[PDB]
Curated annotation (Swiss-Prot), chain A:
GO BP terms: defense response to virus; modulation by host of viral RNA genome replication
Binding-site residues, ATP: 12-14, 49, 104-107
Region: N-terminal inhibitory domain NN, residue numbers: 1-181
Protein's UniProt keywords contain Nuclease: no
The protein's name: ToMV resistance protein Tm-1(GCR237)
Gene: Tm-1
From Swiss-Prot, chain B:
Quaternary structure (record): Homodimer.
Family membership: Belongs to the UPF0261 family.
Result of knocking out the encoding gene: Increased sensitivity to tobamoviruses (ToMV,TMV).
Protein name: ToMV resistance protein Tm-1(GCR237)
Source organism (scientific name): Solanum lycopersicum (Tomato)
Region annotated N-terminal inhibitory domain NC, chain positions: 186-405
Extra facts: Transgenic tobacco plants expressing Tm-1 exhibit resistance to tobacco mild green mosaic virus (TMGMV) and pepper mild mottle virus (PMMoV), tobamoviruses that cannot multiply in tomato.
Function text: Inhibitor of viral RNA replication which confers resistance to some tobamoviruses including tomato mosaic virus (ToMV) (e.g. isolate L), tobacco mosaic virus (TMV), tobacco mild green mosaic virus (TMGMV) and pepper mild mottle virus (PMMoV), but not to resistance-breaking isolates of ToMV (e.g. LT1, SL-1 and ToMV1-2) and tomato brown rugose fruit virus (ToBRFV). Prevents tobamoviruses RNA replication by affecting the association of tobamoviruses replication proteins (large and small subunits) with host membrane-associated proteins (e.g.
Protein residues bound to ATP: 11-13, 48, 76, 108-111
Keywords on record: ATP-binding, Host-virus interaction, Nucleotide-binding, Plant defense
GO BP: defense response to virus; modulation by host of viral RNA genome replication
Coiled-coil positions: none
Gene behind this protein: Tm-1
Any one Gene Ontology molecular-function term assigned to this protein's record: ATP binding
Region annotation (N-terminal inhibitory domain NN) ranges: 1-185
Length: 403, 405
């Protein structure tokens, strides 16, 4: 079985741009092969939502809107799932060597969605009219590239010729280069300004024990990035020291995790020590964009830019739910580890967000809620989270679970 | 002979820079088969720390000192500013020997800012890549209207590891592809356009193609205008029918699709055939109602679609628009023809239609030929049609066929 790339667009309206690209890719694939043996099949793919029907492209193996729509603003949402799943499948026969697509606003968003469900490392490219603006929605935590089109996508000219030529070259080199070619155990750890004592320490120890590290700034995306690399198969254990992202979720901060937090790790059945890193705060900023439902709470303006808000006792009770829920479904080994005195630089004896009534409630609540579960151990400990003796715990708890 | 540049802050990112450059070299070489010549990879330090780095593996290497030489408060920023300016000037020189085949870089937040400015001054077409911790955010500041490509770094730049090995590897192969492909190897006009002028442009597009010209159509969105002007400066667009100058409007009143004070200079500096006109000067862009500067809650507010609202320009405002255009036009060191539609400047400024007001349109007309009367390069044609009548369209194209070779 030989390797195959996909050139994907809306074919009814952009046949000429897409033929141009497809041609240039196949050509460039061929010109850049060395060790080779295989040529890479270049198949064009239509994802037009219109009733208009184009059923071949040049000579290329082609696949019309239907064949894609068959796989299980609402026009985009349909066809993108169709693509995503259409691509899930081709990945499986195990010779999807890349994806490429062109598109303006609506199309970019369509492709973006399909492409970034592919394994990190498979080359994902889109020549896009909306590359040069705001791309978070499109790229996210993936490695998707977006080539600015410079001019609109309307037929081949002067400019589109070079721009499309360059992106085909780009994509052909990626795909060959990867056809024509880890060692360590990487762990990943989640950090916040106010929890680095703990994380720095653990990163240190981890390095000396022989393990490699990937720290994530728990910004929601940060968390999700981690899980999308474990899921990928890059991160072989986690120490989720900082779970503040959960707090921003149940009360609605500006750096929330979404409701799938932890699944990816548990689904991949990999060593998972965990803790309450920074559960004491939910994030916002500046003051007036903070909702008027709590202009009477314990806030700590960190910058003009960001503002932190201290989690009430009741809110921490809710954090203990979310985490325990997910934890209790644990298909393999786990270990919670709680700092009793405080969960953050600011939740410190003397400091601004100190409250052990909180961080005791949170400690018990999770001691009880996880009480039954066999795999998930729990270790309440007589420390603050930053005390490097905690760090020893975490790395030790982890050392236990791991090979 | 051709040469590429791997540019970074060696001081802190040495391993990643070397790895990247190694992969670029490999990929260059392997992809170049079949062929001869062979592309040099030059590593270059754009570090602002004093920490000196003087080599990297076996590559022709240029440290900070040597960059900073050829350059023509809050220090960090200032140091970035200068390093960036330095780099820009270093690449220009690199490019003058016609031997700059490509440029690739790595950066975090500040590094993307440093590399970006410097890379987008190089001609469209020369491969320009950056692997960046801030690809997956808000990139207009960096990419502007250029072909700069930002690959998302996926994790931090933070030593070699599984993830950055594959990302860096795909970026270097991407880049080596763009570089070899390009190494191995009419009269275009541009036209500004708004919804309410698509009759006019569509019809001018059609006529021009039949006359044997290629056409590029830019949404007059502020960006669009600059987009076009940078491409004329880079020789991709040899004449312009600037039908729709609505941007000039959003500028003086303060809209969401504002041009800037440089509008027209590129066209004139290139000395290229410029037919111009008053397209959609009857309106100024906002969206939505709710955010419209409270000082006019009484002006004629059109709702186009929830997110986007238009506001009818007053006579005082048109008088100004004239000045801006006149002033800039008067600098013409070459041929230029205005063409004014006497009847209207928009589907919205049409007998029966909301933004009608032939006072504005006469004011504008008179004010323009007044201020250009003396300029004998500019030929102000007043035409008894509406902007969207296919005879105006021919008018435009004739005026253009006139000035052009």
């Amino acid at each position: 079985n030989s390797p195959r790339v996909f050139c994907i667009g809306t074919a009814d309206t952009k046949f000429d741009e897409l033929r141009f690209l497809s041609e240039h890719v196949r050509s460039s694939l061929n010109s850049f092969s060395n060790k080779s043996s295989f040529k890479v099949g270049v198949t064009v793919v239509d994802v037009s939502t219109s009733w208009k029907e184009t059923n071949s492209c040049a000579d290329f193996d082609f696949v019309p809107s239907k064949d894609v729509l068959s796989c299980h603003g609402l026009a985009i949402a349909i066809m993108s799932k169709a693509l995503e799943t259409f691509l899930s499948i081709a990945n499986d026969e195990q010779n999807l060597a890349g994806v490429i697509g062109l598109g303006g606003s609506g199309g970019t968003s369509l492709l973006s969605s399909a492409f970034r469900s592919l394994p990190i490392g498979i080359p994902k490219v889109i020549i896009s009219t909306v590359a040069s603006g705001q791309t978070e929605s499109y790229i996210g935590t993936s490695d998707l590239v977006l080539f600015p089109s410079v001019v609109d996508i309307c037929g081949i000219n002067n400019v589109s010729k070079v721009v499309l030529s360059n992106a085909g070259a780009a994509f052909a080199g990626m795909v060959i280069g990867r056809l024509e070619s880890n060692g360590k155990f990487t762990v990943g750890v989640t950090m916040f300004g106010v929890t680095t004592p703990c994380v720095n320490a653990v990163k240190e120890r981890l390095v000396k024990e022989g393990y490699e590290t990937l720290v994530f700034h728990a910004t929601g995306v940060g968390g999700r990035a981690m899980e999308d690399l474990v899921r990928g198969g890059f991160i072989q254990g986690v120490l989720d020291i900082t779970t503040t992202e959960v707090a921003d979720y149940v009360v609605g901060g500006v750096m929330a995790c979404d409701s799938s937090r932890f699944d990816a790790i548990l689904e991949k059945k990999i060593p998972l020590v965990l803790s309450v890193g920074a559960l004491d705060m939910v994030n916002f900023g500046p003051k007036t964009t903070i909702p008027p439902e709590f202009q009477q709470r314990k806030i700590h303006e960190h910058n003009e830019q960001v503002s932190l808000m201290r989690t009430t006792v009741g809110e921490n009770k809710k954090f203990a739910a979310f985490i325990a829920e997910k934890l209790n479904k644990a298909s393999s080994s786990v270990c919670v580890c709680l700092p009793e005195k405080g969960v953050s630089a600011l939740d410190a004896p003397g400091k601004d967000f100190y409250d052990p009534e909180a961080t005791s409630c949170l400690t018990r609540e999770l001691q009880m809620l996880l009480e039954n579960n066999e795999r998930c151990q729990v270790k309440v400990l007589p420390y603050h989270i930053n005390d490097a003796e905690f760090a020893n715990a975490l790395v030790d708890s982890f050392l236990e679970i791991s090979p």
